[PDB]
Write a protein that binds this ligand. Structure first.
Ligand code: MG
Ligand code: MG
Ligand code: MG
Ligand code: MG
Ligand code: MG
Ligand code: MG
Ligand code: MG
Ligand code: MG
Ligand code: MG
Ligand code: MG
Ligand code: MG
Ligand code: MG
Ligand code: MG
Ligand code: MG
Ligand code: MG
Ligand code: MG
Ligand code: MG
Ligand code: MG
Ligand code: MG
Ligand code: MG
Ligand code: MG
Ligand code: MG
Lengths: 48, 185, 121, 260, 118, 243, 96, 134
RNA sequence: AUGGUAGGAUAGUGGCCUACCAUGGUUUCAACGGGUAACGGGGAAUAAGGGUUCGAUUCCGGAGAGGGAGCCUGAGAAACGGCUACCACAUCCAAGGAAGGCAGCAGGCGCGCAAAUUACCCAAUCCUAAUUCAGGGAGGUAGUGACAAUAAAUAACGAUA
RNA sequence: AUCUGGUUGAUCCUGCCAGUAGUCAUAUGCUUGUCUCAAAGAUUAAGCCAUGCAUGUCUAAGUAUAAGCAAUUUAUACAGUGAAACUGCGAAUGGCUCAUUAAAUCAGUUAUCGUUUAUUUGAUAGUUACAUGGUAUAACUGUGGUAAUUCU
């Protein structure tokens, strides 16, 4: 909320890769590991 | 009061924001030649649109006027200097048939990986951007290099780089110092 | 309208004041002496209302019957305020809640001296 | 404005001077002198951009104090003196001479000149009148008003001027079939032979010049400078020899130079 | 502090547009006129200082006026001004008769001489 | 624009800095380890008046400083740090609230945060944020601008009307903040400027009866004004009636 | 930029009953009065009375069969503080 | 494993200034830029002149390292070096001292203060001396 | 007002002005008048083509230095970092008097949704002069700066299972 | 060189609204690591400005008795440098802004056999005490004035 004043750079779920590695993760999500759901392309599946 | 420094855009956004086939096509390209954005596809499509506009307003006029042979052979000489257009296809019609992949495999991003200097395409991305692999005598940290033909048979690791010789890096001599003081104690 | 002295004037101001409270005053160059006027019937009591929003990182409970001093304006007054929700009614009745609502802005009416400028509390 | 201007910004310089556009804000404005402002060359471009013998604007001036650079036999110490067309430029410490004649692409060209050919300079006669005390005087194109010429001189003829005395040596009659330099305009740089002169009344006169590679062009009579008769010029022509080339055969020349 | 201009005849102050080659004004730019006030040449009760010049010597001497005498600072500098100052002939050389000023500095006593002109 | 420059001037002729002006400055620092007289020192070293400080050292807390550099009359209020309600009383009357900050120690989440929130919710006019420990960090200025940006990011979180935390160690920035505290029109807090208020410089007493007498207050009236019939509240004393 | 005036509890029936929590705002530069929508607040505890605001455009189509009104203006800033930072509880507001 | 190799590029003889000018190219493997002092005293015996008579400036180290391109000068004697060089390079070489003058603001202020008076001014000095003596 | 003469005046032609004459000149092919939040142009944005909408602003040309007018000097000014008067602002005053135009560079107030530093320097680009040398907020450097524009870090490998 | 949702029980049209993309076009919100480059009080107030600066200039070569310096090695007319001042020149360029202006400015294109032109460049003048006339003044010395001016 209010950040503590020690934000001087000079002198929980695991984090999520960014940049090129995120494009790697989307490629291997969609096309390397194709999830065959009911004959269609279901992104974000629930309990089914 | 100066000459204003000229500046121009280089990418061009698509007209429709959301369609599935075009999005899947860029994500296939960006996963398989190892890019980081869609902007590296938008720039290449804008360059393709520029060379196709040049070929189109070349092609509508009469043959054997010297403007046509001048601009056309200069354009296709520049395109065969990169190697986007192959040597058997030397007509202005076959420039107009060319596509995005044919610009896109001539990056340094790709022809480090195709030349056997990296294990992955993103391993080629990391071994360019961390100042390791030089085009002859020039260190680059740039994957968008558009490798020429005569510069293709000069690409190896940099003399400054640990893979190309010299002393090792900071992590290696740091751990060498760690086992050095471990063996000393 | 009938302001006798407009602002920005050096004024000599005289106050009817009991003798026994003269020990509690201080030096005017060591401590401030703020002088605030009040409006018509401001000393007169009424039933009034206050809005109420709890401060952040404050999870300690308040019920509707404990002494709580309100700082609205310059006067401070100890009160045991009634807590409720500000939902508008055709017959102007409201639900008395026993404690403060931890989520939204509640409302707090009580018997207190009136303030005719909508000062924050 | 309210009087004469005294500056010249970089973007409004003449393009054939070939100044940089990001070195600064201003161009050298030439001062007043022999030639017109747009078709001249001060000494600072000639000693900094086209010869590299100085670096700054102060080091070219540090040339021009030491009485080294001579223009038309006399020393000129102004940095912005418009040494225009056809004059000789003398460097005594490099003991070699320079002539300002155009290149084939419409700009000024460097030219190596011997000591004998630096002794004279040709001049297009701009106007002939009858001056004070009834004398004739001929105004050649760089502002020299030579008194007392030959009687047979007319307008647009070219006189060879001996530089030491400032007199007239010999002239060339403005007839057909003569070697003609082109002075300015878009089609600048060529030499050639006049086909015929096209006379027009009350306007501009045109002239058809066919070069050694049999190409005929038309320029106005203002932009015509006579060199001589067929094949024997009175000056020594720059490299490329006053023929322009089409751009495709120009790079065909330019790819025919490499042999490593 | 406003001086009296010779010529204006009124015992009051009148603003004038003063010019180059007159008194009470110095043109800062070339050909410059400014509307300055100036007081008249008629003497009234408003004058803090009135300035006088001796024309005729009276009987009684004055201390700071008759007794004290300052010499002239600069000698003549044209050759004919030397000649008319000393009453010389046309054949007489001006070189010997120039006025030399002796200036002392430290231990060395050195004399100056004006550069003659014409 | 004629009438609008007319009433802008008529709003600005309350601050005739020769005789009829009164500007109230309250300087509060947000950490335990600051002295506000050092902030007063660093601000008025750009006005170049030693003798006012030579008067101001010995034992005085409320000052009436006149400046000839900008021709404005100032009155500067220091708070007592042992009472929170005293700091509330300082900043609820002041036309300028100045927040002192430390470049060494981070501000307290148990003291200075609630100072910021309580003054923020009680109502603030035009405010100044400023630093004084920026010389106490490492003397290379490249380390100091990162500290300055950290103070800017902290002070933007509760005061988004301003974006720059200013420095007293810079003389020109001291001139800038002195210029802003002299010239700028402070914004009006609606509840206090609709009843009229006097800050008092001299208090005296006149005996009338043995049980009650007459206070004497010499001050400058600020707000909508005072009428002789309406009642007047005194903090920590209550409501009294006028004579 | 504007200075707020009142609290407008307009009821607007068909088809959706919008409990309109919107503020009448007097502008600064011209001296005429427009209504103004306050976004994203369930309570409108932020834009209090006589607090200066900044209005922006809003192209809402008012309807005919429910007599719902034409309110063209939305608030992007209150007291110099953005309303989107206040609704996300990122920054704070000087109530003045 | 360092070898400081100094190769002079595009040498022209410039008799108008009694100098010669050339671009200086340096291959310096495993070396972090050759000093102007070391390269100056290295060009000195190569061009057979004195160390105080030759000048270098404008070095841009190439990307990647091991390479630097500048612009070098050699004068025939030291008198041409103290005559024809700019004064800042003669400051840089220890051949001339930086004249300690005040900055631009109080130079302009002293010019506008000395423009304020007319004449020598010591007449005004004895004038104001007897005025505050009064 | 359009033209004819003759003169004046100008640096000069010219109703530019004065005398004496004629009654003419423009216009539905848009004159005359009104509006423009209208400096003009090179250009910018967006377009298959045809267009549409801006152009105060890095270059060229114009006008102005709070609004008008008048003029000395000079080759060149109806100059404003020159003067004179009036109109409106407005400074110091010891009350008598005296000086002012930042739409130059910073900077301040006001205004608005809307726009930076009272820094360094002639070393570059060039300009002025009696002229190497002095001067130049013209200009260059640096600071503030998510107006825009180009390139691109946020990870890459193995081995186990 | 592309369209798409919204009238109706359902359909085909006409029609606009809304969605879409760009703006080297402005403002604002959230966020912000790098390298180069770079606009920046135009819009509204061509409204008001504190203060500081922005125009001054000297060569072997116009005028030096600075009662300035350096003394110094030929220099009793001077001769080195040189504050001030006279004289010559510039200050009419640059910089800023866009208020007025709709055959006005301007763009391209002519003309001056209809004119003025410091400067530069080239020519141009045996015809009117001469071992070279005269006079003012500044700078300087001294006396002054007023609260105050680049006053005198
Ligand atoms: Mg101009
Ligand atoms: Mg042409
Ligand atoms: Mg006539
Ligand atoms: Mg008449
Ligand atoms: Mg306009
Ligand atoms: Mg424009
Ligand atoms: Mg405008
Ligand atoms: Mg601008
Ligand atoms: Mg003008
Ligand atoms: Mg103004
Ligand atoms: Mg002049
Ligand atoms: Mg004027
Ligand atoms: Mg001007
Ligand atoms: Mg001005
Ligand atoms: Mg300005
Ligand atoms: Mg500038
Ligand atoms: Mg200079
Ligand atoms: Mg950007
Ligand atoms: Mg739409
Ligand atoms: Mg404006
Ligand atoms: Mg001398
Ligand atoms: Mg001449």
């Amino acid at each position: 909320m209010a950040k503590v004043h020690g934000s001087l750079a000079r002198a929980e779920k695991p984090k999520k890769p960014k940049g090129r590695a995120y494009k790697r993760l989307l490629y291997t999500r969609r096309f390397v590991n194709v999830t065959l759901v009911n004959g269609k392309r279901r992104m974000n599946p629930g309990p089914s | 009061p100066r000459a204003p420094r000229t500046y121009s855009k280089t990418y061009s956004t698509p007209k429709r924001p959301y369609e599935s086939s075009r999005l899947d096509a860029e994500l296939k390209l960006a996963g398989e030649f190892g890019l980081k954005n869609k902007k590296e596809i938008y720039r290449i499509s804008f360059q393709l649109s520029k060379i196709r506009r040049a070929a189109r307003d070349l092609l509508t006029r009469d043959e054997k006027d010297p403007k046509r042979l001048f601009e056309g052979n200069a354009l296709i000489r520049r395109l065969v200097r990169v190697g986007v257009l192959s040597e058997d296809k030397k007509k202005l019609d076959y420039v107009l048939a060319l596509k995005v992949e044919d610009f896109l495999e001539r990056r340094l991003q790709t022809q480090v990986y195709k030349l056997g200097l990296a294990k992955s395409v993103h391993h080629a991305r990391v071994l360019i951007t961390q100042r390791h692999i030089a085009v002859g005598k020039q260190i680059v940290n740039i994957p968008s290099f558009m490798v020429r033909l005569d510069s293709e048979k000069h690409i190896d690791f940099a003399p400054t780089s640990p893979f190309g010789g010299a002393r090792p890096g900071r992590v290696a001599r740091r751990n060498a110092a760690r086992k050095a003081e471990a063996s000393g104690e | 309208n009938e302001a006798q002295a407009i602002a920005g004037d050096r004024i000599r101001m005289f106050i009817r004041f009991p003798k026994f409270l003269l020990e509690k005053i201080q030096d005017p160059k060591q401590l401030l002496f703020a002088v605030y006027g009040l409006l018509l019937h401001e000393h007169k009591n009424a039933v009034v209302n206050f809005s109420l929003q709890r401060w952040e990182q404050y999870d300690k409970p308040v019920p509707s019957q404990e002494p709580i001093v309100v700082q609205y304006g310059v006067r401070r007054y100890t009160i045991q305020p009634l807590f409720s929700q500000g939902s508008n009614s055709p017959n102007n009745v409201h639900k008395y809640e026993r404690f403060l609502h931890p989520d939204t802005v509640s409302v707090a009416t009580c018997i207190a001296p009136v303030d005719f400028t909508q000062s924050p509390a | 404005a309210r009087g004469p201007k005294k500056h010249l910004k970089r973007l409004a310089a003449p393009h054939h001077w070939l100044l940089d556009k990001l070195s600064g804000c201003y161009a050298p404005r030439p001062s007043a002198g022999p030639h017109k402002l747009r078709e001249s060359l001060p000494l600072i471009v000639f000693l900094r951009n086209r010869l590299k013998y100085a670096l700054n604007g102060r080091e070219v001036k540090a040339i021009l104090m030491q009485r080294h650079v001579k223009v038309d036999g006399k020393v000129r110490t102004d940095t912005t003196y418009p040494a225009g067309f056809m004059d000789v430029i003398t460097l005594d410490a490099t003991n070699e001479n320079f002539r300002l004649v155009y290149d084939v692409k419409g700009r000024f060209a460097v030219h190596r000149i011997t000591d004998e050919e630096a002794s004279y300079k040709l001049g297009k006669v701009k106007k002939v009148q009858l001056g004070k005390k009834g004398v004739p005087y001929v105004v050649t194109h760089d502002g020299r008003t030579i008194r007392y010429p030959d009687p047979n001189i007319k307008v647009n003829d070219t006189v060879k001027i001996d530089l030491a005395s400032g007199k007239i040596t010999d002239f060339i009659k403005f007839d057909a079939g003569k070697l003609v330099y082109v002075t300015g305009g878009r089609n600048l740089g060529r030499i050639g032979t006049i086909v015929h002169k096209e006379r027009h009344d009350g306007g501009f006169d045109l002239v058809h010049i066919k070069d050694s590679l049999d190409n005929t062009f038309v320029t106005r009579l203002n932009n015509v400078f006579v060199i001589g008769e067929q094949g024997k010029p009175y000056i020594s022509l720059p490299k490329g020899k006053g023929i322009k080339l089409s751009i495709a055969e120009e790079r065909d020349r330019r790819r025919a130079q490499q042999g490593l | 502090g406003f001086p009296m201009k010779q010529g204006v005849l009124l015992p009051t102050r009148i603003k004038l547009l003063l010019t180059k080659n007159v008194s009470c004004y110095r043109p800062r730019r070339d050909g410059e006129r400014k509307r300055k006030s100036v007081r008249g040449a008629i003497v009234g009760p408003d004058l803090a200082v009135l300035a006088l010049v001796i024309v005729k010597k009276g009987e009684q001497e004055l201390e700071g006026l008759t007794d004290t005498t300052v010499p002239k600072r600069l000698g003549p500098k044209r050759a004919n001004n030397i000649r008319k100052f000393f009453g010389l002939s046309k054949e007489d050389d001006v070189r010997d008769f120039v006025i030399r000023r002796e200036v002392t500095k430290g231990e060395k006593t050195y004399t100056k001489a004006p550069k003659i002109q014409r | 624009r004629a009438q609008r420059i007319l009433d802008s001037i008529e709003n600005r002729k309350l601050f005739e800095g020769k005789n009829g002006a009164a500007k109230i400055i309250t300087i509060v620092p947000l950490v335990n380890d600051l002295d506000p007289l050092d902030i007063l020192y660093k601000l008025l070293k750009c006005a170049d008046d030693e003798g006012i400080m030579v008067q101001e050292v010995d034992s005085k807390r409320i000052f009436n400083v006149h400046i000839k550099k900008f021709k404005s009359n100032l009155k500067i209020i220091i708070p007592d740090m042992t009472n929170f309600l005293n700091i509330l009383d300082c900043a609820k009357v002041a036309d300028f609230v100045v927040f002192g900050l430390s470049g060494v120690q981070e501000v307290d989440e148990e003291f200075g945060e609630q100072i910021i929130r309580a003054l923020e919710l009680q109502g603030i006019a035009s405010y100044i944020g400023v630093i004084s420990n920026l010389s106490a960090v490492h003397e290379k200025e490249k380390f100091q601008l990162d500290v300055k940006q950290s103070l800017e990011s902290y002070f933007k979180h509760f005061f988004p009307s301003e974006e720059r935390v200013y420095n007293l160690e810079k003389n020109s920035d001291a001139l800038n903040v002195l210029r802003t505290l002299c010239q700028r029109l402070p914004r009006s807090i609606n509840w206090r400027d609709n009843r009229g208020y006097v800050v008092a410089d001299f208090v005296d007493f006149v005996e009338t009866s043995p049980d009650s007498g007459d206070l004497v207050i010499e001050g400058t009236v600020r707000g909508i004004g005072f009428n002789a019939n309406r009642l007047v509240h005194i903090p920590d004393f209550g409501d009294f009636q006028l004579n | 930029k504007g200075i707020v005036l009142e609290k407008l509890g307009i009821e607007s029936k068909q088809p959706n009953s919008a409990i309109r929590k919107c503020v009448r705002v007097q502008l600064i530069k011209n001296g005429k009065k427009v209504t103004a929508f306050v976004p994203n607040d369930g309570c409108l505890n932020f834009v209090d009375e006589n607090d200066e605001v900044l209005l922006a455009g809003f192209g809402r189509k008012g309807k005919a069969k429910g007599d719902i009104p034409g309110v063209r203006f939305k608030v992007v800033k209150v007291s110099g503080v953005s309303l989107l930072a206040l609704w996300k509880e990122k920054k704070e507001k000087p109530r003045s | 494993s360092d070898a400081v190799t100094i190769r002079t590029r595009k040498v022209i003889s410039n008799p108008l200034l009694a100098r010669k000018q050339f671009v200086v190219d340096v291959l310096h493997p495993n070396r972090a830029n050759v000093s102007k002092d070391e390269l100056r005293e290295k060009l000195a015996e190569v061009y057979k002149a004195e160390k105080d008579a030759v000048s270098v400036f404008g070095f841009r180290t190439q990307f990647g390292g091991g390479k630097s391109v500048g612009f070098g000068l050699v004068y025939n004697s030291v008198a041409e070096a103290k005559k024809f060089e700019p004064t800042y390079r003669l400051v840089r070489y220890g051949l001339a001292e930086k004249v300690e003058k005040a900055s631009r603001q109080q130079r302009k202020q002293k010019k506008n203060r000395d423009k304020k008076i007319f004449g020598t001014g010591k007449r005004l000095a004895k004038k104001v001396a007897r005025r505050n003596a009064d």
